[PDB]
Amino acid sequence: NREEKILNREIGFAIGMPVCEFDMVKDPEVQDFRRNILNVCKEAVDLRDLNSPHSRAMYVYPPNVESSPELPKHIYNKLDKGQIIVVIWVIVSDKQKYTLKINHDCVPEQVIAEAIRKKTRSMGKYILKVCGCDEYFLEKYPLSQYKYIRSCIMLGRMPNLMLMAKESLYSQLPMDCFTMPSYSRRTSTKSLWVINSALRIKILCATYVNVNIIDKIYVRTGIYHGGEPLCDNVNTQRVPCSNPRWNEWLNYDIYIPDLPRAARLCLSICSVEEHCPLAWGNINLFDYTDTLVSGKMALNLWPVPHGLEDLLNPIGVTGSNPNKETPCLELEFDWFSSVVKFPDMSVIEEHANWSVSREAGFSYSHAGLSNRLARDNELRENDKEQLKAISTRDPLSEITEQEKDFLWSHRHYCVTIPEILPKLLLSVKWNSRDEVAQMYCLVKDWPPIKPEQAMELLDCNYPDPMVRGFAVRCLEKYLTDDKLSQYLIQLVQVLKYEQYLDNLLVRFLLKKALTNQRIGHFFFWHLKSEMHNKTVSQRFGLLLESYCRACGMYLKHLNRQVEAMEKLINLTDILKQEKKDETQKVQMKFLVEQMRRPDFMDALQGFLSPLNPAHQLGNLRLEECRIMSSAKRPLWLNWENPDIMSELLFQNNEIIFKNGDDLRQDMLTLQIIRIMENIWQNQGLDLRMLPYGCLSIGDCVGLIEVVRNSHTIMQIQCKFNSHTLHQWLKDKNKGEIYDAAIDLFTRSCAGYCVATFILGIGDRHNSNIMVKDDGQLFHIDFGHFLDHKRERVPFVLTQDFLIVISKGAQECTKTREFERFQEMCYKAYLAIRQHANLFINLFSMMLGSGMPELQSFDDIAYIRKTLALDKTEQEALEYFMKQMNDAHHGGW
Numbered sequence: 001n002r003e004e005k006i007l008n009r010e011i012g013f014a015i016g017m018p019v020c021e022f023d024m025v026k027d028p029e030v031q032d033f034r035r036n037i038l039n040v041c042k043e044a045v046d047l048r049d050l051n052s053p054h055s056r057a058m059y060v061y062p063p064n065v066e067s068s069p070e071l072p073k074h075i076y077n078k079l080d081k082g083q084i085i086v087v088i089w090v091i092v093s094d095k096q097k098y099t100l101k102i103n104h105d106c107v108p109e110q111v112i113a114e115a116i117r118k119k120t121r122s123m124g125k126y127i128l129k130v131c132g133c134d135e136y137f138l139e140k141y142p143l144s145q146y147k148y149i150r151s152c153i154m155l156g157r158m159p160n161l162m163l164m165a166k167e168s169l170y171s172q173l174p175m176d177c178f179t180m181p182s183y184s185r186r187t188s189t190k191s192l193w194v195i196n197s198a199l200r201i202k203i204l205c206a207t208y209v210n211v212n213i214i215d216k217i218y219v220r221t222g223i224y225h226g227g228e229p230l231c232d233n234v235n236t237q238r239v240p241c242s243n244p245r246w247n248e249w250l251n252y253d254i255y256i257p258d259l260p261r262a263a264r265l266c267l268s269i270c271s272v273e274e275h276c277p278l279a280w281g282n283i284n285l286f287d288y289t290d291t292l293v294s295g296k297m298a299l300n301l302w303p304v305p306h307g308l309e310d311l312l313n314p315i316g317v318t319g320s321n322p323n324k325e326t327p328c329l330e331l332e333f334d335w336f337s338s339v340v341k342f343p344d345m346s347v348i349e350e351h352a353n354w355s356v357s358r359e360a361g362f363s364y365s366h367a368g369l370s371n372r373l374a375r376d377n378e379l380r381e382n383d384k385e386q387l388k389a390i391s392t393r394d395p396l397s398e399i400t401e402q403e404k405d406f407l408w409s410h411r412h413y414c415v416t417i418p419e420i421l422p423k424l425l426l427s428v429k430w431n432s433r434d435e436v437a438q439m440y441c442l443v444k445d446w447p448p449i450k451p452e453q454a455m456e457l458l459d460c461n462y463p464d465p466m467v468r469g470f471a472v473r474c475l476e477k478y479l480t481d482d483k484l485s486q487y488l489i490q491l492v493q494v495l496k497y498e499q500y501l502d503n504l505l506v507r508f509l510l511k512k513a514l515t516n517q518r519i520g521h522f523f524f525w526h527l528k529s530e531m532h533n534k535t536v537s538q539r540f541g542l543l544l545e546s547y548c549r550a551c552g553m554y555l556k557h558l559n560r561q562v563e564a565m566e567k568l569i570n571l572t573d574i575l576k577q578e579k580k581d582e583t584q585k586v587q588m589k590f591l592v593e594q595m596r597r598p599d600f601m602d603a604l605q606g607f608l609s610p611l612n613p614a615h616q617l618g619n620l621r622l623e624e625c626r627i628m629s630s631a632k633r634p635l636w637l638n639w640e641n642p643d644i645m646s647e648l649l650f651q652n653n654e655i656i657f658k659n660g661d662d663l664r665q666d667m668l669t670l671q672i673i674r675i676m677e678n679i680w681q682n683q684g685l686d687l688r689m690l691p692y693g694c695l696s697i698g699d700c701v702g703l704i705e706v707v708r709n710s711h712t713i714m715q716i717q718c719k720f721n722s723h724t725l726h727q728w729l730k731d732k733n734k735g736e737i738y739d740a741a742i743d744l745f746t747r748s749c750a751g752y753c754v755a756t757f758i759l760g761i762g763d764r765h766n767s768n769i770m771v772k773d774d775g776q777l778f779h780i781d782f783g784h785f786l787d788h789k790r791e792r793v794p795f796v797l798t799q800d801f802l803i804v805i806s807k808g809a810q811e812c813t814k815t816r817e818f819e820r821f822q823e824m825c826y827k828a829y830l831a832i833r834q835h836a837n838l839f840i841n842l843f844s845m846m847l848g849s850g851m852p853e854l855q856s857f858d859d860i861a862y863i864r865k866t867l868a869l870d871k872t873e874q875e876a877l878e879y880f881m882k883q884m885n886d887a888h889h890g891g892w
């Protein structure tokens with residue numbers, strides 16, 4: 001009706017394209033997704049009104065909590081006999097302060113009781129809010145499990161909480177009525193396993209093949225399961241590019257009933273002997289309804305990515321190019337007088353049971369015919385140790401063919417060491433329906449593994465839907481909202497590897513986004529930021545449509561953020577194309593004049609920070625905004641924090657808006673830094689890092705959190721001697737606090753030395769290392785990582801840094817300060833090595849992004865080198881010291 005049309009305009013504005021463009025899409029998969037996904041929308045809305053208004057408040061303001069209440073011993077020992085000092089504020093008439101000393105693990109209702117006790121000594125109706133931002137303690141966790149409280153304990157800051165009446169929070173949460181949209185109102189058939197025929201596909205002709213007359217041309221093809229070929233590639237005959245017509249049947253060395261569910265056809269047009277791909281494309285051999293492709297098809301192809309010289313691109317995206325003014329290959333598939341469907345699960349289970357029972361009857365001599373057969377008995381405990389050994393290798397370690405036969409033959413024992421599942425899966429003969437059906441039944445009852453281990457099974461090495469479904473069930477059962485937020489970037493990226501629009505992973509992620517608004521906010525922005533990338537914009541736009549339809553009132557707040565970012569994009573675009581040669585003064589006059597237009601001024605003020613939607617951005621402070629000197633001329637922007645107690649957190653929100661460089665690699669490096677820092681703290685290795693906020697919001701457009709009161713090394717030594725840095729630090733921390741500043745500088749140095757060495761970050765210089773007044777050192781600008789150059793040391797500690805560490809001693813390399821510094825590095829390095837699978841998998845999950853430094857598994861191999869995974873641990877230490885000793889010309 002009329003209200004649906006208004007909502008469609010809002011959704012269209014949020015996602016950057018009109019909803020009517022989805023309505024015109026003819027593809028049945030697209031219209032079925034739009035309709036069928038709505039039961040996730042409904043399920044989520046019903047969880048939110050399950051216990052109103054509390055359930056609604058928990059959705060908008062979910063508890064920001066660590067994944068477990070247990071405190072590292074070094075954190076706990078910062079308390080006074082396990083007790084914490086907190087300040088509770090009450091708004092009365094005027095702000096009244098009440099200081100409490102309570103056990104670190106009282107729940108909020110207890111803290112509120114003690115605050116009222118103290119207040120009445122001055123002679124379930126309240127909640128606690130963090131002073132200065134929109135963060136609440138709505139749930140009965142231990143106080144120290146809230147990240148704000150945990151952070152205060154570690155940083156030695158005083159927690160400041162505000163008492164607030166429940167009803168004054170509930171009052172401001174609009175009830176949203178979710179309405180089902182108008183589109184919600186909507187020869188035989190033979191099993192694949194009965195088709196007794198080999199696979200054959202006809203290449204007819206190519207259109208839109210416009211080239212520089214490049215001469216002889218051919219179509220290369222292959223059948224793939226993930227990246228694994230299921231048979232040899234098959235080429236057409238060569239023809240000249242002026243007449244690209246083949247009409248050639250290609251015969252594949254594979255039996256049709258042996259085609260696995262995720263089988264794909266990968267092809268390309270190649271030039272010729274120097275061969276070179278000109279355009280590529282992949283298609284699912286089964287569609288989303290389990291039907292084998294049939295009839296004729298036109299496939300619009302994709303351009304070759306600069307860097308790839310392979311002739312096929314099977315880890316490239318699957319499906320037709322939306323740009324129809326592109327090389328278009330016409331295909332024809334085999335005809336069978338019948339629709340052919342992948343067999344249902346009951347048929348697969350029957351076949352697996354038949355196979356298992358047959359193999360259990362195999363004689364000794366029969367089992368000897370194949371190393372993939374082993375008799376139940378034979379299993380010795382040395383084979384058991386070898387299985388356990390294999391299960392501890394990292395995801396990029398080669399599994400030899402003999403190892404694969406060995407794993408497959410002992411698949412049933414593997415159930416007792418369930419983390420071996422990823423290696424067992426890469427040992428399956430995916431072109432054998434006998435083996436695959438058995439693997440299906442093993443997966444359906446496989447024991448659960450850790451979410452960090454399950455995430456590997458969603459990357460591009462694991463296309464099978466039963467495998468990915470098991471991975472999703474593991475996340476559903478074990479992944480906390482805290483870790484889902486931590487790994488959300490990767491989980492969004494692996495949506496791109498799903499064969500179909502509707503799948504278990506997207507239903508899981510959408511439901512979490514629609515029941516936790518902190519997850520939903522970044523879900524929205526990660527998807528929105530890629531709506532320019534045409535390999536994913538249909539999938540992501542449809543997903544965003546379904547998010548926007550059910551997220552409730554937050555859609556209106558997102559639209560405030562989208563409009564503000566759009567205005568900043570438009571202004572910076574003008575500056576870089578129409579005024580780029582004018583002086584700063586002139587550009588600044590132009591900028592202030594444009595931001596003072598009333599439509600602009602209103603769009604740029606009074607909205608939530610996309611970096612952290614708990615932070616309200618109030619009125620701009622134009623006198624504090626400025627065009628920075630760095631490359632691409634980013635904007636330094638300053639907003640008032642309108643929170644009634646802003647002075648207790650920060651009174652101004654400073655954000656850098658950068659239009660022109662890709663920020664996705666910085667995003668990923670800052671995420672990894674945070675994970676490393678988390679690993680170190682849990683082990684009681686207190687190395688303070690600074691993973692400041694960074695969010696890509698578009699095509700080379702994004703936001704960066706400003707660390708207030710920090711300076712580059714260069715700013716410092718321009719006010720110079722190699723003692724200037726230490727001298728600056730000592731003057732900032734005179735008295736009894738000098739030692740704490742040296743210690744914080746030493747630990748922060750050790751963390752960044754180790755982190756940047758492991759990741760192969762871009763070379764450090766005195767303009768991309770910064771220091772806070774209190775001694776905390778950190779790095780900025782991570783536009784390069786991994787093997788972008790034989791392993792570099794990006795952070796070489798020059799004399800200035802050693803002088804600080806050694807408290808001003810001339811011979812700083814030969815002090816016990818330096819020795820304890822080295823020990824921190826060694827402990828930090830070995831700690832990350834123990835978690836190498838995590839970091840390898842997090843990188844592998846990002847392979848399908850457009851990030852140029854992260855294109856193949858061999859880019860990730862760099863991490864295998866810096867962590868020395870093929871060495872022993874003591875050999876790994878020795879390797880790290882030599883890299884350090886080489887880079888510094890002595891010391892280590």
Ligand SMILES: Cc1nc(-c2cn3c(n2)-c2ccc(-c4cnn(C(C)(C)C(N)=O)c4)cc2OCC3)n(C(C)C)n1
Nearest residue numbers: 630634692704705706707708709710711712780781782
């Ligand atoms: C890819 C990338 N990343 C960054 C980046 C990332 N950060 C900062 N810049 C950043 C920059 C300045 C400041 C700052 C704070 N106070 N001051 C004042 C006191 C003005 C100073 N020293 O004169 C500067 C703080 C910062 O926070 C760290 C996060 N840049 C930039 C090159 C655009 N480019």
